[PDB]
Amino acid sequence: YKRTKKGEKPMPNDLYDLEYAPSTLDCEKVLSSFDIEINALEASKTKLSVEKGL
Amino acid sequence: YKRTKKGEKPMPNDLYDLEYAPSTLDCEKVLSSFDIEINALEASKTKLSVEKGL
Amino acid sequence: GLIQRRNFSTFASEPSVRFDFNYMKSVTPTTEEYYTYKSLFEVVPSTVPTLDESEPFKYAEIGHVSKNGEVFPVTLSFEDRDELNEDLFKKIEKGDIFLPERGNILISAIRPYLNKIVLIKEDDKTDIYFTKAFIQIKPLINSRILYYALRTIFSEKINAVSRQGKGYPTLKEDDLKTIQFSKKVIDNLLAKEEELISNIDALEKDIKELKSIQRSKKEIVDEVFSSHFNINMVELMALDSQRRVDVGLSSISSLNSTIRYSYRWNKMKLIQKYLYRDIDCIEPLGKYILSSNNGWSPESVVGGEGIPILGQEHLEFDGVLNVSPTKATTKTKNNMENFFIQEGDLFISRGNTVDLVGLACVVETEVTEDIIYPDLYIRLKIDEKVIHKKYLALLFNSFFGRLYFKYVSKGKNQTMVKISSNELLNYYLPIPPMEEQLEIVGKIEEQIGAQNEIEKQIEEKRNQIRVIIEETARS
Amino acid sequence: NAFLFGDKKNSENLFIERYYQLLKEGGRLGVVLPESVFDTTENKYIRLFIFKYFKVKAVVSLPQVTFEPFTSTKTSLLFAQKKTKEEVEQWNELWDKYGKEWSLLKTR
DNA sequence: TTATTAATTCCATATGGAGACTTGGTTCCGACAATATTCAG
DNA sequence: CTGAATATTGTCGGAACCAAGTCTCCATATGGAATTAATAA
């Protein structure tokens, strides 16, 4: 960090490195979230396609 | 003036200027301190010369 | 100050009815010619440039420009995105970047008194971008003419329309579109256009030639000691990079005499083991020092009345005192004569940054005026038979006197790092025979003398340009 | 009345001494000290204390930006263990023997 | 006995400071144009 | 069904500034410089 009287700012940490990639990840949760978002976008596309047909 | 976390600092005065002459001082009031300045010194001279002869 | 008197009406001038003292000082009644921004320059609106994300471009802040209009661009790539330059990339992505159109005269908005006016000459290459804090002002009466008419002359009036406003002195394009440029200036300057550009180009070509061979005042001291002691220049700045110094308990006591176990002390000991691998000349300085004083640093007023006092800015990398006092005191100490410099002294610097601590200087100037040196100096009176004071000062200003005092000097506030007599007396400097000395000195003396000789020629042609412009615009 | 150096007018070092009164003969000690403790001579005593009772094991020099914009004061992390009851007495025995040697040598 | 260092108090120097000052130009909120939408009777 | 809405985006204005670079002026023990009563002698 480099904090100042206006705010914080990232700098290259020499003390330690963050994990970034978690050791454990709920893969099915992530897949289901992506499936939900793509299904929502597909439903929006289908609704607007029905509107286009009308 | 010239202020700093270590006390003020005199600078030239562009706005105004102090008279520095009271123009209301009595006269003999300060002459009392003036003659005390010599009275104390001559008293010390006497208080050493008394035992000088001793 | 001033007893300027004006008349309500005046503040009617300009579409912001402003009545700060500076503007109203610049207004004055006028009887001569007027002009406007019309028959001269023209402000250019900003635009977002199409940056190519495959090649290293350039960029230029306001600090990257100098008072002489010499841009020093930095080279970014968009393939690095390092967190050190991340601010630059972020402000570029924000939209704080544009590209001059080869003929405009960029003017800085913030603090316009520091001559940040720069010229993008027509015939050139290696296009450089710029910050929106610069004002594209592309002219119609030839770029060079307007550039030289704005740099030296027409500067008391660009600086008198700035917005102080509880902070930054700042110039605004709208105010910039209101200056009352006289015609006699441009009339006379364009009248002599055919030869003014020629001789000014010759002068700036000579300036470029001088700058091409100009060298820094520290590298000269850095190379001769490197070229005389046979030490490679690319390892002591590579050994100083790795930071994993490991020491034992036994090594703490060695030559310590105060049990100091800070990291910087151990790294100093490691670097000393490298700077003296092949050099066999090292002798303790403690047995060549005969005395040590500090100085006297009372309260001081800048440009006041009293005995002048030196500062840390007066010690340069060449072992010569700058003896250009600024502060002046009026206090007494009943022993002031003990600190009145006098020629021949050696003054090491106690108290400065981690890199500017230990810089010594010899008073080589003859001054009949008594000048006090502060508590921030240390006067060394060494035997003038083995050390040759000037050589000692040059060594202190060399990497020998940098890689040591950067890692031995003490204090919790590393912004005012200070040395003490202990580090001076426990300093194992390499002292070659007196024959070897006066050779490093002398060589360094002539090299720095040449560098200083071409330091007034630059500020002789750069002044010749200004005086020629002033004479031509006044004839 | 509870600190060996409780009269040095350097009260901020008392905490270090306090840390000896809290650990349990092998207790880890991680402190953010200033670099005056490690550099200046006036603190030599508190450096001997740490070298007598503790088992100094790691020193890390942090930049002058860590505690900014509140202070540019340099800092160092000190990671020291605490010696057991026998290590301190071994140090005392060695100190006494070599001090006797030093006294005899100084007289001679 | 006439010394005596080893005890003292008294100032000039030396070391250090949760530092402090100074030249100069950078981030960034915050209005504010220009959207940025209209629905709505 | 004409509308100039509001509703955001994206961008000029502007900062009891303040991040960078680097010079300081002053408390405070010290230690030595003066004693001392000691100290043999």
For the CA of C142 and the C1' of F22, the distance in angstroms is 42
In chain B, what residues touch C301 (CB-CB under 8 Å)? Answer: 2, 9-11
B8 vs C8: CA distance, rounded Å: 38
What is the amino acid identity at position A42?
Answer: E
Q: Check if the beta carbon of residue A34 is closer than 8 Å to that of residue A41.
A: no
Report the nearest residue to nucleotide F18, CA vs C1'.
A5
Rg of the Cα trace of chain B?
A: 21
Which residues, in sequence order, are CB contacts of A3 under 8 Å at separation 6+? Answer: A9, D68, D69
How many pairs of residues across A and D have Cβ atoms under 8 Å apart? 8
**Record: contact D35-C259, CB cut-off 8 A:** no
- D51 phi and psi, to 5 degrees? -80, -15
Beta-carbon contacts of residue C212 (< 8 Å; ≥ 6 apart): none
Amino acid at B15: L
Length in residues, chain A: 54
Statement: the CB of C63 is under 7 Å from strand F: no
Strand F bases near protein CB (under 7 Å) are 10-29
- In three-state secondary structure terms, D16 is helix
- Structure determined via: cryo-EM
Nearest Cβ partner for A5 among D60, D65, D69: D69
Q: With beta carbons less than 8 A apart as the criterion, state whether C328 and C305 touch.
A: yes
Resolution in A: 3.1
b/e sequence D46-71, b meaning 16+ C-beta within 10 Å: bbebbbebbebeebebeebebeeeee
Is there an interface between A and D (3+ Cβ pairs < 8 A)? yes
- Separation of alpha carbons C155 and C304, rounded Å: 29
Partner residues linked to C349 by β-bridges:
C377
d(Cα C293, Cα C379) in Å, to the nearest integer? 5
Binding-site residues on chain B for chain C (CB distance < 8 A): 2, 9-11, 14
Q: Taking Cα atoms as reference points, which of B25, B1, B30 lies closest to residue B13?
A: B1
State the Cα–Cα distance between residues B14 and B1, nearest whole angstrom.
Answer: 10
**Cα(B9)–Cα(B3) distance, rounded to whole angstroms?**
6
Q: Do chains D and B touch (3 or more CB pairs under 8 A)?
A: no
With contact defined as 3+ CB pairs under 8 Å, the chains touching A are C, D
Residue whose structure tokens are 């256009």: C193
Q: Do the strands C97-98 and C74-76 form a parallel or antiparallel pair, or are they unpaired?
A: unpaired
